[PDB]
Design a protein around this ligand. Structure first.
Ligand SMILES: [Ca+2]
Length: 489
């Protein structure tokens, strides 16, 4: 019995100790598991973070190399321009000095025939653009090329048409006023394509193409000319021109419609007509012109006394072609029949159709007389029917048109041409163009652009790389203590 009691006492001690050791390990395991949880959360986040870090460094690297490609190019252009700067500037200064001297010399002849009364250089080179592209908007009607062709083949222009000639001033617009003549967009017509061997009254040294529209008073067509290759302002390339043509409500042509033929070559101008087959007395047709020239960057060019040519201002015994309501200042060419009166530019004192008639000095068309044929782009004395307008600013305008003489002055103030009636009706149409082809003689031209100081590009900011962090090592397994040995009797 004594042993048994002893054994039981030892047994109790064992059981209690065993319990302690177990609870101790259980708590030890609880901690280990908690450590494992944290370690796993740390690595999981560390992995996802390292992956992200890997991505960012890749992007930063790529974006950087992308900036270097652009930099490498801009830097190459900068160094090149800086190298050329002095040579370009020299050409500029040299020409400016040359122009200054030419102008001083011209001062001595400013009152001689063909000379601009107020000596000036022409900083606007704008006179030939055969490859120009035309795009039109309008609040009027676009006319099918086939409709224009059919119109030329009928009525008053038929005789010429059958002779392979497109006589614009004979075109009867009566046949362009039907709904079936309206096109869904601009269409070109002229002596090209299947009519490449035909003649037109617009030019006799080149093929011409034009888009057509039918407009009423107050309606307009806005032409955007691009792909210009030979035009400049102060030597800087002119890449685009936006020109808006509006039918002047004050036009007195009979009827409500006007045919507008806009040539793809902007320097060729436009043909405007309300001619319906018969001449009209007390008639007129005026077209308002609003235009802006743009540089290569699409920025409007702010003219500084550019010279706009206003030529071929015909004045017959019963008809006056004129320019009015214009921006800028009129500059007269000495000896020219063209002057300014009552805010209008035209042959103010004499006619200019035939020498000896109405005080005209020369005949507009070629004949047996010396100096005849002044009305042509190449005539040496084409200045006889021309003048100029000095313009400044990015937005300029001028209204050009033809009107019966009786609308401008009483018959009593008119030149008399024996055998001709000054009240004779006329056709309400006109061809005209506004460009930089000044007809005055020896006008100095600006061809060298003043270079701007090259702007050095900035090397791209170095990429910011981040390092990936080392993954955390797993927790160490705890060393659980042994359990006591049960006692024996
Ligand atoms: Ca003319």
């Amino acid at each position: 019995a004594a042993n048994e009691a002893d054994y039981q006492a030892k047994l109790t001690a064992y059981q209690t100790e065993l319990a302690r050791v177990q609870k101790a390990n259980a708590d030890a395991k609880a901690a280990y598991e908690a450590a494992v949880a944290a370690n796993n959360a740390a690595n999981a986040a560390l992995t996802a973070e390292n992956t992200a870090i890997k991505k960012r460094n890749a992007d930063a690297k790529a974006d950087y190399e992308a900036k270097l490609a652009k930099y490498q190019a801009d830097l190459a252009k900068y160094q090149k321009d800086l190298a050329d700067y002095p040579v370009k500037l020299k050409a500029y200064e040299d020409e400016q000095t040359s122009i200054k001297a030419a102008l001083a010399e011209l001062e001595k002849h400013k009152n001689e025939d063909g000379n601009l009364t107020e000596p000036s250089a022409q900083n606007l080179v704008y006179d030939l653009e055969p490859n120009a592209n035309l795009s039109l908007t309008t609040d009027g009607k676009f006319l099918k090329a086939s409709a224009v062709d059919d119109a030329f083949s009928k009525s008053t222009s038929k005789a010429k048409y059958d002779q392979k000639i497109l006589q614009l001033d004979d075109l009867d617009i009566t046949n362009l006023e039907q709904s079936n003549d309206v096109a869904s967009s601009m269409e070109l017509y002229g002596n090209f394509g299947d009519k490449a061997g035909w003649s037109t009254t617009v030019s006799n040294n080149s093929q011409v193409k034009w888009g057509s529209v039918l407009l009423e008073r107050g309606q307009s067509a806005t032409a955007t000319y691009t792909n210009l290759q030979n035009s400049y302002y102060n030597g800087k390339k002119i890449s685009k021109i936006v020109y808006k043509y509006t039918v002047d409500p004050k036009s007195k042509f009979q009827g409500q419609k006007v045919w507008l033929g806009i040539f793809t070559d902007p320097t060729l101008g436009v043909f405007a007509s309300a001619y319906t087959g018969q001449v009209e007395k007390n008639t007129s047709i005026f077209i308002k012109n609003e235009f802006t020239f743009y540089d290569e960057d699409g920025k409007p060019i702010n003219f500084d006394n550019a010279l706009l040519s206003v030529a071929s201002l015909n004045r017959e015994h019963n008809s006056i072609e004129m320019a009015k309501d214009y921006s800028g200042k009129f500059v007269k060419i000495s000896g020219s029949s063209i002057g300014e009166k009552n805010g209008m530019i035209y042959a103010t004192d004499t006619l200019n159709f035939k020498q000896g008639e109405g005080g005209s000095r020369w005949t507009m068309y070629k004949n047996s007389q010396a100096g005849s044929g002044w009305d042509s782009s190449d005539a040496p004395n084409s200045w006889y029917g021309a003048g100029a307008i000095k313009m400044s600013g990015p937005n300029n305008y001028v209204t050009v048109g033809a009107t019966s003489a009786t609308n401008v002055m009483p018959v009593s103030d008119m030149p008399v041409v024996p055998g001709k009636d000054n009240t004779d009706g006329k056709k309400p149409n006109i061809w005209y163009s506004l460009n930089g082809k000044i007809r005055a003689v020896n006008v100095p031209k600006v061809t060298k652009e003043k270079p701007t100081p090259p702007v050095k590009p900035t090397a791209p900011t170095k990429p910011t790389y981040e390092t990936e962090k080392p993954l955390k090592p797993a927790p160490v397994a705890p060393n659980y203590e042994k359990e006591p040995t049960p006692p024996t009797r």
